[PDB]
Structure 1
């Protein structure tokens, strides 16, 4: 029993170090990419500050930094503190609390909207702990249904491509068609609709798709997030997209996992060779 456990802990620990190292590379590449724009916006926000620090000296000026604290603290709930727009829609209306519930059970958790009430928080804890598992079943069923829809599709395509054919190499043609068609239906096509309806850039759309469907859900972009107009054919279609798109990414991510298993065997055995053939 302990013989396999010693072999297991050895594997976990190496993957752990790989993960630590993956984070370090990651970290350096993100700071390489973002630290600059952050500094150029931090210098040009101090420029804008001084233009109204000294352009109104009759303001206490310790209370300006405190004013902004009260705006940024209050923006998190979601305020539109203007006199040319003192009338305002609700964040917790019939539909947005529905959306919010969606963000909890799917663990996307955008967080543009999140509970402020101690009761809302306590309900959210309970709602999540029951809802996440519940949704998991739905998402599984959605995965199966969609899986068998594609099974009927590959029965028709693995017959017509039976020319003068291997068992294990037509598997490679199938997984390409899964990724190809899948990226159209669940990534490309919806990003295009998002690009048009939200006014996002082409990158922002795909970025949103991926961040949402991987359940990362930063919440920097949220489809349905602004007050624009919205056809109301729109948002329901986006629910359905989430439902099926999450199922799709579940598989895709899972495939990527398998590819890593493979690449990890191939590299484990390559290093053994490379060590043994020190001559080279």
Structure 2
């Protein structure tokens, strides 16, 4: 009965699909609740700034002012500092910043502050990604293993001394607390602190940046290394290492969260099974 299990499978995929549809709608409405207000205040007050300089200089043709801004915003995506007081500039595609970019491709973070303009750069980026991504995978997989076997020796010692007057599958609960507790210190708390100090971001922004980057979402609204500050270059390498090990960590963490849902889902599926079966007496 091969098609008997296939009918069961399509029934599962579909309910999850609808759960995910529903999840997007909830999310959609909570984001627009949160962001539509500040957007409206900032759009009224940017038209306030506009009319102050629109009529304060009528001798500018005035259909060309919105065309000027289009030439600035188009050119900001390639990354420019168009000013008289700072017309000498650093490079976006120097030795290092192209090494950084290559990293955003293979990890699939893809911040995208810097991205290829040349038709060749795009064609190479496509080739570089398709071979790079799988390749990086194996490293991040091995970075997983090692870091796993490190914490494997770390729980042998702590599941020896906590052998008091002891269940097997309940000491699993105490281990996974030590994974999340120490884990959020090493790959989230401590690095966010460093970022707060070095970059000059808010406490929230750092942790946000940590999570957005290590989940490989990589908006790129904040980027470590991104501004022209000073930089120790003890710094930037330490971040490469952080990324290597942080991405490993979040891969597990997300995988745990995944399994918790599996469980929560059985429970809630059989709780509805109960709710129907009693349905008022």
Normalising TM by the smaller chain, what interval? over 0.9
Q: Any gaps of 5 or more consecutive residues in structure 1?
A: none
Q: State how far apart, in whole Å, the 2-side matches of 1:223 and 1:168 are.
A: 41
Per the alignment, in what secondary structure is the counterpart of residue 49 of structure 1?
helix
Instruction: Tell me how far 1:180 sits from its aligned partner.
Output: 0.1
Q: State how far apart, in whole Å, the 2-side matches of 1:276 and 1:161 are.
A: 43
Q: TM-score, structure 1 length as denominator?
A: 1.00
Per the alignment, in what secondary structure is the counterpart of residue 201 of structure 2?
coil
Q: State how far apart, in whole Å, the 1-side matches of 2:280 and 2:136 are.
A: 57
Q: State how far apart, in whole Å, the 2-side matches of 1:265 and 1:278 are.
A: 20
Q: What do residues 104-139 of structure 1 show as CA deviations (whole Å, max 9, x unaligned)? A: 000000000000000000000000000000000000
Q: What do residues 2-58 of structure 1 show as CA deviations (whole Å, max 9, x unaligned)? A: 000000000000000000000000000000000000000000000000000000000
Instruction: Tell me how far 1:196 sits from its aligned partner.
Output: 0.3
Q: What do residues 259-279 of structure 1 show as CA deviations (whole Å, max 9, x unaligned)? A: 000000000000010011111
Q: What do residues 147-166 of structure 1 show as CA deviations (whole Å, max 9, x unaligned)? A: 00000000000000000000
Question: Which runs of at least 4 in structure 1 moved beyond 2 Å after TM superposition?
Answer: none
Q: State how far apart, in whole Å, the 1-side matches of 2:196 and 2:106 are.
A: 26
Instruction: Tell me how far 1:141 sits from its aligned partner.
Output: 0.1
Q: State how far apart, in whole Å, the 2-side matches of 1:100 and 1:150 are.
A: 32
Q: State how far apart, in whole Å, the 1-side matches of 2:195 and 2:146 are.
A: 26
Q: What do residues 38-92 of structure 1 show as CA deviations (whole Å, max 9, x unaligned)? A: 0000000000000000000000100000000000000000000000000000000
Instruction: Tell me how far 1:240 sits from its aligned partner.
Output: 0.1
Q: What do residues 224-260 of structure 1 show as CA deviations (whole Å, max 9, x unaligned)? A: 0000000000000000000000000000000000000
Q: State how far apart, in whole Å, the 2-side matches of 1:126 and 1:166 are.
A: 52
Q: State how far apart, in whole Å, the 2-side matches of 1:243 and 1:49 are.
A: 46
Q: CA RMSD in A?
A: 0.4
In the alignment, structure 1 residue 40 sits paired with structure 2 residue 41 = yes
The alignment of Structure 1 onto Structure 2 pairs a total of residues equal to 280
Per the alignment, in what secondary structure is the counterpart of residue 81 of structure 1?
coil
Per the alignment, in what secondary structure is the counterpart of residue 164 of structure 1?
coil
Q: State how far apart, in whole Å, the 2-side matches of 1:124 and 1:271 are.
A: 49
